[PDB]
Symmetry: C2
Subunit: 404 residues, 2 copies
Amino acid sequence: MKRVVITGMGIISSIGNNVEEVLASLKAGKSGITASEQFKEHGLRSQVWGDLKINPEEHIDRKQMRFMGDAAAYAYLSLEQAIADAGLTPEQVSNDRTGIVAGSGGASSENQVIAVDTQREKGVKRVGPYMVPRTMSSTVSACLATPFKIRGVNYSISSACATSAHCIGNAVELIQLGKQDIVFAGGGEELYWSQTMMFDAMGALSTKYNETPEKASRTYDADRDGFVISGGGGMVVVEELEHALARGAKIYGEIVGYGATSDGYDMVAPSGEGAIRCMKMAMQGVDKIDYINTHGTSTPVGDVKELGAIQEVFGGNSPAISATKAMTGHALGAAGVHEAIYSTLMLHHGFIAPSINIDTLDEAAQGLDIVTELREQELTTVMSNSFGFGGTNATLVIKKYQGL
Amino acid sequence: MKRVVITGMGIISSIGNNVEEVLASLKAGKSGITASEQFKEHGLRSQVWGDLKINPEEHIDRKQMRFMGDAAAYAYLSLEQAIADAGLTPEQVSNDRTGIVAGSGGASSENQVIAVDTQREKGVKRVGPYMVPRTMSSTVSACLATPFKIRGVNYSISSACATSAHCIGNAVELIQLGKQDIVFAGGGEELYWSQTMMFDAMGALSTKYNETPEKASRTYDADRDGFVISGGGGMVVVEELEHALARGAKIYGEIVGYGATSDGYDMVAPSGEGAIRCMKMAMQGVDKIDYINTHGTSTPVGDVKELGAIQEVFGGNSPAISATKAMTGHALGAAGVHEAIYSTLMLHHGFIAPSINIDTLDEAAQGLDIVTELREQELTTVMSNSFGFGGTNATLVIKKYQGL
């Protein structure tokens, strides 16, 4: 069966506008979380966010930007970064054997609001002709495929917080089936009050730390109280191994494992049992995991179910564990690819990022190695978990490529 | 490589609430299009729709319905039908080797409107806790996976008008990779003024036939003027052939071909060139395509590009062609699965449904066999095309299974 590698990466996240900024933040344990004036103005109880410190409309031509909400815009910038990082020629980017699988958890709640307000006040003719590509569920794939002249597969996968992890897993599968040699995979998520409001309405967000935003996201801490919403974009170049080697590609790592399962249990709370199956499926034929980047959103139930699953899968002398969401917040549709990137940077640069803001460690973490300080060491294999509403689970396992 | 068959079908469309009704409508060339008072009351120029003549709240319990917009609800009812058609008990339905791949072009524009209106008037605390599963891009997969206790793969694919065709294709791929034995595949779409309005704003919808709704959708007619919007749900049970045979399953057909390509050209208009590649990729060695169910939305440019592609693929030896959208309207995220089902019924029952409302045939169709009256005959192989915004193309090819 064909082997699959990561050959390029691009990112916009709360902790950096490109890989070099992200890498610096990960090593420092620097929070990307700030107070949100927007959320406060709209009367939301959660008033913190992992905001993106970039204005995409400054970096993209009107001809492309007219079709995009921020999810597509962040992903577009990420794809530009990844293509440059990969050293791909134009003939490789626009090629029958080169595709895109990239999605969003939402799409553009902001443009829905704008279009509806505009139509009610000013009439359908003043809405303009660009709202369908901004708001449709395939916005991220559609808005990138067209200007990058993608000729291979082109669609979005959605699965709430697992979205961009399944995008990467599907890419791997396309390559293993022999259908594509390269697939650009990832996702994007806009950050706007109207989407956030729906999570606030269900009680999912942190509300007790608005006065101290950098302390609000605190995975595994006894006083955690929900997630901090974020967004952004991420793209990785997923490529068949021989194709990568023949062109002298940079190889960050090999995707040696992909798990996708379903709990069949509750719409909002994880079962634990589905995650066990998902991890095990991703670990089939994998010798040893050095580090796990957990889904770890800073929720009371969620954090515990995942730790129980990890303990059951690994037993004693577990891998090192950290939740980068304590720094970044929850990037929703972009979380899977952000955390694959974070994990791959850890793999490539030889460090583990700290799990920050743990003042009192939950008892469910007993007998696990929760990393709370930067740890510099060679890693051979990493694992990243993503679990979404609807009981949907994705796990990716990435190993160093070492000439064998 | 593993062979894949269709063993169950379920559908809610403008031309029927189940397969028996839909079959009758196809044979009669019966329009599912009516006047929309809702669209008129909101000041839209297009005032016709392929509405769904069903009350989902009559048929779904509050416990499931609370999480659903109409896209999930129509898909849920379709899944119930397909499961019965396939003869499956809760044991095969809830199984590690049984999954779901099902999506929507939008998600729930309606619930976005409701949540925002409620929040502005009454505050976030009165919005209630169910809005994220209703509105998120994975609503269809998530709202079905939980109550049916799905344990295998669980995600949504999105690609605008191609959405549910890629869902089917991906299911086939999961089976070919050996990951699943059964995958429930399909899609859903709500029909609501706020979504429709965004298409009306870009000039895509039929506006000249509001007085005579059954004449508005008229693919290949010289006086066509845009599509008629619709929605609904569809699901198929996609199953590994040996698994189907071992349990004595009724088999409707074998999926012998799946194409997925991208134009890389224009966000809204098809290139023609992508569709050529897509058709050919789906023609996995087949002797002869007998019939093509075209994407055929009743637009001036779209109808012509597809015909030119068909001419490029087949030369002088064209299959019989019809556009069922002239009867049904354009079901968006549900169009792919609806038309796979229509095409499979034609294959299974031995007929070709007419392409209705052609008073003056476009000059681009000269020397093609456009079917305008019910044609009763044995078919061996059928093809269904779905092309979406963002230049995304899917084709499915389905062949009769007769013991070889």
